[PDB]
Point group: D2
């Protein structure tokens, strides 16, 4: 037997005895992902066929994939009639859905993460976080400022050697791989659980001069294990989706802490950190800022940044112990 | 207008007054690359059918798509009636082509490079180097033990966010992107030249305790520039084709020097180092082991390894100077 | 805005306040169609790659597309958990679904009609008819012997110049075209209605010597209009799905009456005639055996044959008047 | 092994000691055919964006995919640098290639044949005929007014249940099927030969009142065989490429003789009749107007029409004998 994302989502909706609004929401996001996947695998042939350049300027008629993807996602969520407020990396303010197409869900997303490095063909992806409209007030961007802990569903689509949709909900994480021949996501990893301890650390060491004492010490341990065990391997694709997915599948740790130029980290809280933290915790892993759990942070701005350390529970705990080791001696 | 790889190869063969053998050899590689690309984009799906039940156990790594990809390349190369000797990373001995299908080219290739990175969907690729049999003797392993400097054609196929075929010949380097809809590689970057100086360094710093003094001093200088400039950003996909292609496009430096387990480096000279070195040099970059030019090494073993440092000339030269500074002490 | 089959079916299910069982059934049939479409567009490359021949013999390991498609459809309907009894052109007896995967729906289908002429690449398709389990008895093939008039849903997938899924339900006929790039059926014709009168007649005239008086007279009228109007055009693809779809879109009439070798017509009642009659009537057209409406026939055998005349209401009525013109003078 | 069209063409060019111009011309056609095929399989979708609002109105028929397909062929042919004169069914005058892109071949083609059959998704195709400029003069329309007998290459692409490219040259006829997954045409039928006698006749019998005595007597004989054999089955897709390809594969006869509106037939001699006639003859079949061989007609108008009867030799000869029997009275 083979399970398609479409069937899995439908059956989960039925068991949840939902009204079918969330199901439509997920179906819509899935369709969006397939369209973005198709475009990504041919990005260079589009950004050139219809004029091009070397700079980074988007217009009206001819716009980059980044804008395209964002337009596609928004259009599909508004058409699902399941949302009321949308938050995107590409929009300064939150998008309030038209009353006539208004649903009860709030969606935070990164339409095409790592796109800034699409030129070198490195993996890129789409990150999403879904919230249930809490208050009865009129839809507003405050509705998208709920802590990750209130997430009903979260995940990402990774456009790497293959395209994958990782979906996490209250009962677990499942990975579905896209078969481009039939346009169907096939379940290939059920109820994923990250291993307790890994052997790979992921961080941009070019910021070494700006790292805090704890991180500086942790990296040294990975290279020079005091107990003389085997040093960890290092991997840093430069694309959050790619690095996190590898962490999820092979275990280990991924880090993007605060430093000099980034006193509060670089990764965005609403559509980058929370979703990834949610997937991690649902997989038995940890996601912390180094002092507090990411999902517990109280968001104050939709574009707020946040430090993030995540991955295997033992590796993250080890780093947590180092942070605790530092303070006011 | 829009130039397809098929048209570009044919016209180059015509200008060179070739008998068509090499043109046919290249046509065959392109076809094989498309087939591998299609398989890669759904590798996880092709699987799932009762494998065994492994987790880590340091041992077997031979994946199914690895062998199939190899068999495809071999079958396609023999069928081209343009080769006499084949060297694959998957075959312990050189493959000698039967008399009837024998041509005059020697092909060294890595069918599907990027081992520890398919299960996590990291970018992977196919690497190739082509030599003209420089002998009147009966075809044998010796015909493949030529220095990279003798290559008449070299390149790689990168299965990343998109699929790219990069071809380098005497005339220079060109990048063609695969449009999966029509099965045609479209020329998207002509006569590629590498940036004289980059701002990214690429290496697995996990082997830090095993690095020689030159590499060690170099890494520190990238993190703590003595001239107080902005430090280099770090990137290491863990897939040679992915890391090298980013070096080609964004510039900078890629490094895989000798370490404990790899006293002479890890990367294979014939089908990993040489092709990448040839591409870099045709693009105006440099490829050194730290002491000598990769392309000028005369191999004695088809599976011989070699340390490699490649990328922007100013970046590679700066490291070269460190090496000779220490050697001058 | 653009409507996908997936969304249309979901929204229709919700408005119908269904439990989601029929929705899953249609989603499953849709997925099946995409897989069959993919195989059909490459049929000749499969029936050859894995051995071949000229005869018509299927085995165990290597079976023809016909069997493949049938295996795919059955497997997908049993996995939808929405059916209890299945009737296929390829199976002598009805298939009683396993209790554990038993649903309330009865499905009659022609997995790959016109496949016998796949060799010439003529259009082929998949026909389906869906019934609601009436009695409370144990599932049996008598459950599939309901008159077409009891159809809840019916339609077909046409694999022609493009792939199309035509779905008919109580409120109308809608056509969705498959976009092979994203694996999605896009709504392209809403609530289809056949024109009142056409200008094309479709029948195999090679059976002229075996036609009854009425049909012989009707064909003469189309070629030699008594009122000297323009003679109708003739079209006969030889594939029911193709001929009917054209009739639906361009109007006119399609005929496969009884003759010599076929005293009761050739086309099957359960998975060929009824579904097409249902689509026709739902589109404002007519489907008659020449004396009685197809949907009103009381099926007595799952493989029963039946004469069928269908298409524009005025063209079919005209022929009905001719039949009435003949009897016992 | 598996032979791709790309490899088959190249090797044939090599055996012929061609300079590569014709090989490049054929490579270009193949690429264009793949692009048209992809568009065709989703033509209905490419549309939908505010056309106008027509129903029947005997007038405009020029579809959008018709022009785009034509522009593609032209652009692709000029870019091949192998042609000097082009004749398209869509251009009122011959297209003369600019000096810089001028080669020595003349190409007559029908970009997307199958007018009254795309909206109903009937099979459609692309037809082509290639001539060597047999003149030292300045390229002009005259270079295309050669008799079919002078063709150096002819064929068609059929977008049916699958996409097939049929190529005929002095050596014979070969059929290649397009694998849309890898964008390669696979040789599936080598040195095709037509059945000496078929059991299918193909004609639009709607013009019955306009048929000459020979065609009339022939049709009756197919329905009421004087030797009491089984009558021929009838087939008429309404798309020349579809009907002709079935004639090639199953054998039999295809007919489109002169009628009222078409006193000299409907089908175009240069880019419809001749290519199909050349294919038939290279396959051992016959192609006649009823009085003379299609390939021996010297055209005087590039858009000239001609009656055509083609297919199995015994079937075509039997009709030929009827024609001469009447002419002998
Ligand atoms: N497809 C689904 N998968 C998982 N949980 C679902 C699904 N549909 C609905 N639910 C759950 O049921 C709640 C109500 O669904 P709805 O009526 O569609 O808004 C959602 O907020 C989820 O907690
Ligand atoms: N398609 C081509 N592109 C570039 N150089 C070519 C091509 N075909 C032939 N050559 C050159 O011509 C030499 C002889 O080609 P061949 O006769 O095909 O073995 C090759 O070794 C190349 O140096
Ligand atoms: N997706 C749907 N589209 C149209 N009608 C539907 C749909 N789902 C359910 N229905 C109608 O509601 C009935 C009960 O649905 P169910 O509970 O799924 O068996 C069906 O027999 C149909 O008449
Ligand atoms: N690919 C090919 N297949 C078949 N015949 C070819 C091919 N290439 C060249 N020829 C033959 O050689 C002649 C001269 O080719 P060219 O020098 O390319 O114009 C053509 O007109 C054909 O008769
Ligand atoms: O170059 P840096 O500072 O390491 O940033 C890399 C990070 O930036 C992002 O692109 C954020 O958009 C992430 O995908 C990635 O992890
Ligand atoms: O894990 P390590 O030691 O950094 O090695 C990674 C390298 O190995 C390979 O996977 C093959 O040797 C390369 O693609 C990659 O550059
Ligand atoms: O060759 P005949 O007798 O006209 O039969 C054609 C009919 O047979 C079928 O193939 C039945 O399987 C129909 O698709 C088609 O309409
Ligand atoms: O409708 P008619 O007169 O039979 O003509 C159909 C013929 O016309 C064409 O559509 C083009 O003239 C051919 O493809 C087909 O054979
Ligand atoms: Mg981002
Ligand atoms: Mg390798
Ligand atoms: Mg049938
Ligand atoms: Mg035409």
């Amino acid at each position: 037997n083979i399970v398609t994302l479409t069937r899995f989502v439908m059956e989960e909706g039925r068991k949840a005895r939902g009204t079918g609004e969330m199901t439509q929401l997920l179906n819509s996001l899935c369709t969006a992902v397939k369209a973005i996947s198709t475009a990504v695998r041919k990005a260079g042939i589009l950004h050139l066929y219809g004029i091009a350049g070397s700079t980074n300027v988007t217009g009206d008629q001819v716009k980059k994939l980044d804008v395209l993807s964002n337009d596609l996602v928004i259009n599909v969520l508004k058409s699902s009639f399941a949302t009321c407020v949308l938050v995107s990396e590409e929009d300064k303010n939150a998008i309030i859905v038209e009353p006539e197409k208004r649903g009860k869900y709030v969606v935070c997303f990164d339409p095409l993460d790592g796109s800034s490095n699409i030129d070198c063909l490195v993996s890129i992806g789409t990150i999403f976080g879904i919230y249930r409209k809490n208050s009865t007030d009129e839809p507003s961007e405050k509705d998208a400022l709920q802590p990750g802990r209130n997430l009903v569903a979260a995940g990402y689509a990774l456009y790497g050697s293959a395209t994958m949709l990782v979906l996490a909900m209250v009962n677990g994480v499942n990975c579905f791989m896209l078969d481009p021949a039939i346009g169907e996501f096939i379940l290939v990893d059920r109820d994923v659980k990250i291993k307790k301890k890994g052997s790979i650390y992921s961080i941009n060491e070019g910021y070494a001069k700006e790292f805090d004492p704890a991180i500086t010490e942790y990296i040294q341990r990975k290279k020079f294990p005091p107990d003389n065990s085997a040093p960890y391997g290092a991997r840093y694709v430069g694309s959050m989706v790619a690095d996190v997915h590898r962490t999820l599948v092979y275990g280990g740790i991924f880090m993007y802490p605060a430093n000099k130029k980034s006193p509060k980290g670089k990764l965005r809280l609403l559509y980058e950190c929370n979703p990834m933290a949610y997937v991690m915790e649902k997989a038995g892993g940890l996601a912390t800022t180094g002092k507090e759990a990411v999902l517990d942070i109280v968001p104050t701005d939709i574009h707020q940044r946040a430090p993030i350390i995540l991955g295997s529970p033992e590796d993250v705990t080890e780093l947590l112990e180092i942070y605790q080791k530092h303070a006011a001696k």
